Each structure stands twice: as structure tokens, then as C-alpha cells.
């Protein structure tokens, strides 16, 4: 049903929260499709999740640009490498089964939770004090 429950530990700017929450929602969708052993849906939700992650990444990066965030370069590269990783994981789904989907999911969760708490948290105060919401 639910793999990841939203908590204050994942909180950031309000606008950013809407995107992180949506990513958590995709994770849970993908979990339910795996639980249902529905591989077509699993592949479809994984595609949507990946596409949405890329747009969320792009949104952060635009905030880094507009606001001249000093660590814009490293954070962007972190995003880029993870897109690469997601694209690699995706290839396994064509021939994979629900257990493959689960293993992928744990990977996605582990990265996302860490990234939000460790990397995304670094930009929060900087953007807050410049009036970003």
C-alpha cells in the first residue's frame, strides 16, 4: 500500500514540498503496481516517476540559477548522475518481474530520502532568506 510516508524530516520550502510529496506519491504508486504484480503498470509508473524527477530537478536547478546559489554546480551533477542511474535501472524492467521492481524501488527510496535530507536541505535556508517559497 504505502512504502514511504511523508514526514517533517522531508520538509523544505513549501513549493519544494509539493514536488517531493508528488515524488513520494509516484514511489507509492510503483509499490502498489509491484504488489499487484502488474508489470505493464509498473513500467508505466516508473516512466512517469523518472520524467517527473527530471522536471523537479530542473525546477531546483532554475532556483539555483535565478538565486545564484554557490553550490549550483555540484547539486546539478548529483541530479545528472541520478538521472543516468534511473535510466540504467529502467532497462531491467523490460524483462524484470515484480521482485525486480521491488529491488529498484528500495534503490529509488534510499536515494531520494538521502538526497532530500542531505543535499536538498542545504539550499533551504539560503533560499528562505532570499524570499523564496
Automatic annotation (TrEMBL):
Signal peptide range in chain numbering: none
Domain Hemerythrin-like: residue ranges: 16-125
Encoding gene per record: dcrH
Residues that, per the record, bind Ca(2+): 84
PROSITE patterns: HEMERYTHRINS
Family statement drawn from the similarity comment of this UniProt entry: Belongs to the hemerythrin family.
Keywords, alphabetical: Calcium, Iron, Metal-binding, Oxygen transport, Transport
One MF term in the entry's GO annotations: metal ion binding
PANTHER family: BACTERIOHEMERYTHRIN (PTHR37164)
Pfam families per the UniProt record, alphabetical: Hemerythrin
Protein name, per record: Hemerythrin-like domain protein DcrH
SUPFAM superfamilies: Hemerythrin-like (SSF47188)
